[PDB]
Design a protein around this ligand. Structure first.
Ligand code: ATP
Lengths: 203, 224, 136
């Protein structure tokens, strides 16, 4: 009765914390599904601009009656490149909002555990059950989710910050370095944790 | 009481987590995530966080050295050394207000400062310690050396999201004789393209840059 | 207090079972697993009447007829089990440790096989499997 209130104070904090992670995981997957045809379109524009940069426009005998074609074609191609990149900065702002509110909720959970720490023993934290995992497993899984979101955001931000229009082999390799970022992570991390804690959540 | 040492799993690699049994956590009186200083057997020490094993069995110790003394990454456990318990201590961590780091970068100031804040976010660190970046980390900082701090990290302390990060810096074979005559003939050529911070761009040309060494097979040309 | 009856596993249901527990799995009812103090995700030990044993992972099924352990057909061949027999289920209180050297004997002999990528297939599809001598 005296120790009844401290453990149920941490358990409703975990119950509040998990569906927030489910909602932002849906937001993250929608933004990552939107990012790919923009990168394919940017690779097509890099191909067209490198093919225009290879060529001289006075040795072609038909193209002497239009002696200003190069900067006009270059101007239109680069106006389409600025559209695609501004659309891509919008997706990066969505990923930043997801990262910030996930980290604030995880810090709130660890603060309420630090407040209610010494009253409950180690043996109350370590005890598992037939419907729920222990408190220490769920806190460790929340810390893993936070670290995965931080690392994936900074890898995608540095790849998006290395784009220049003076080096065009980089723009045609960007498409596969994005898939190499997505293939290097721990596959299906959030869904397994939510499937493990769903019996604790519904009860 | 003696505890064995085991190699770490694939989920503890680069997480700064020490996996203890329940009797050792009862004897230390530690909570989850509290700071444990491990005095290593072959000199040096490291700082870790206490987390429990899933099995509940007591008699085993695993450790991941990330905040280490320099040249004290001796946590490989091929020979299976045993550690005694008298070598682990529970160390209080006050929060900090200012740190001082010296960075070792991989092969501007704002990106190096942003990568330092991002690595050291919510960690316990001590003085004269190397913080090593985990593999696959984004950015350009490979390591940090801890120099100083205002609440004095000699019994260590915790960096917070609102602490300040500042950048200071203080890092404290066969001679073969017989080729003496030709060893300095090489320098009278090659010393002048070694003292060049674009000074010979400003005044001069370029002495040759294309030397050739010849000799019988065994006079030690590669070692020269 | 330990003797249950075997049955086949419920089909479908492959969107409510985490991907790391796919090839090592038994299913149980919630009141049966509440009775003989088994937790979710922890290993259990299965012993038949012949003395053959296996170590698997429990999952809350919420459905299986109360009193029915569900095993796959490779488990039923490995322990020696027809569907409709008796089996002894226990939880593990000891320790599980990382193996480092595993002598395996190939059965029959197909094309001698690239060994290193056969070892890659073994260590990719079988992870977290608790091994005993004499199991397949
Ligand atoms: N002052 C010296 N002059 C010549 N040889 C020496 C001297 N001191 C040591 N050595 C010997 O010479 C060895 C160096 O051999 P090294 O590989 O440099 O030969 P090399 O002349 O470059 O050979 P190669 O003609 O096959 O390229 C040393 O390991 C040592 O055994």
């Amino acid at each position: 009765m005296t120790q009844d209130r401290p453990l149920l104070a941490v358990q409703e904090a975990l119950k509040k914390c998990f569906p927030v992670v489910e909602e932002q995981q849906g937001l993250w997957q929608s933004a990552l599904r939107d990012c790919q045809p923009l990168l394919s379109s940017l690779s097509n524009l890099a191909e067209q601009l490198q093919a225009a940069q290879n060529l001289r426009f006075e040795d072609v005998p038909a193209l002497r009656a239009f002696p200003d074609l190069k900067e006009r074609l270059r101007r239109k191609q680069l106006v389409a490149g600025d559209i695609v990149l501004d659309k891509l900065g919008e997706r990066l702002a969505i990923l930043l909002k997801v990262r910030d509110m996930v980290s604030s909720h995880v810090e709130r959970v660890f603060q309420i555990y630090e407040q209610h720490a010494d009253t409950v023993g180690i043996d109350a934290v370590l005890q598992p059950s037939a419907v729920s995992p222990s408190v220490a497993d769920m806190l460790e899984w929340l810390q893993d989710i936070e670290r995965h979101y931080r690392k994936s955001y900074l890898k995608r931000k540095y790849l998006l910050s290395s784009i220049q229009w003076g080096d065009l082999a980089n723009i045609q390799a960007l498409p596969k370095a994005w898939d190499r970022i997505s293939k290097d992570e721990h596959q299906d991390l959030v869904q397994d944790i939510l499937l493990n804690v769903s019996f604790f959540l519904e009860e | 009481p003696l505890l064995k040492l085991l190699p770490l799993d694939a989920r503890d690699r680069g997480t700064q987590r020490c996996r203890l049994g329940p009797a050792a956590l009862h004897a230390l009186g530690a909570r989850l995530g509290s700071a444990v200083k491990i005095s290593l057997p072959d000199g040096g020490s490291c700082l870790c966080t206490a987390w429990p094993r899933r099995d509940g069995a007591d008699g085993f110790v695993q450790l991941d050295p990330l905040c280490a003394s320099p040249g004290a990454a001796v946590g490989a456990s091929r020979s299976r050394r045993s550690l005694s318990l008298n070598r682990l201590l529970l160390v209080p961590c006050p929060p900090l207000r200012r740190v001082a780091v010296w960075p070792v970068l991989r092969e501007n100031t704002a990106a190096v400062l942003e990568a330092a804040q991002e690595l050291l976010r919510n960690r316990p660190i001590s003085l004269g310690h190397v913080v090593v970046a985990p593999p696959g980390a984004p950015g350009l900082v490979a390591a940090l050396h801890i120099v100083g701090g205002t609440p004095s990290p000699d019994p260590a302390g915790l960096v917070t999201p609102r602490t300040r990060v500042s950048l200071g810096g203080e890092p404290p074979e066969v001679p073969l004789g017989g080729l003496s005559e030709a060893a300095d003939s090489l320098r009278e050529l090659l010393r002048l393209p070694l003292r060049y911070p674009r000074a010979l761009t400003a005044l001069g040309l370029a002495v040759p840059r294309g030397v050739l060494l010849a000799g019988p097979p065994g006079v030690g040309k590669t070692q020269l | 207090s330990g003797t249950l009856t075997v049955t086949n596993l419920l089909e479908k249901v492959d969107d409510k079972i985490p991907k790391t527990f796919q090839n090592s799995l038994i299913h149980l009812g919630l009141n049966t697993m509440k009775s003989a103090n088994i937790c979710i995700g922890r290993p259990v030990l299965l012993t038949s009447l012949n003395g053959k044993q296996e170590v698997y992972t429990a999952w809350p099924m919420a459905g299986f007829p109360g009193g029915k352990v569900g095993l796959s057909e490779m488990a039923q061949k490995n322990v020696g089990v027809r569907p409709g027999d008796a089996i002894q289920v226990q939880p593990l209180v000891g320790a599980v440790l990382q193996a480092e050297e595993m002598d395996v004997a190939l059965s029959d002999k197909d094309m001698e096989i690239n060994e290193e990528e056969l070892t890659g297939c073994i260590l990719r599809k079988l992870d977290g499997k608790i091994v005993l001598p004499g199991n397949f």
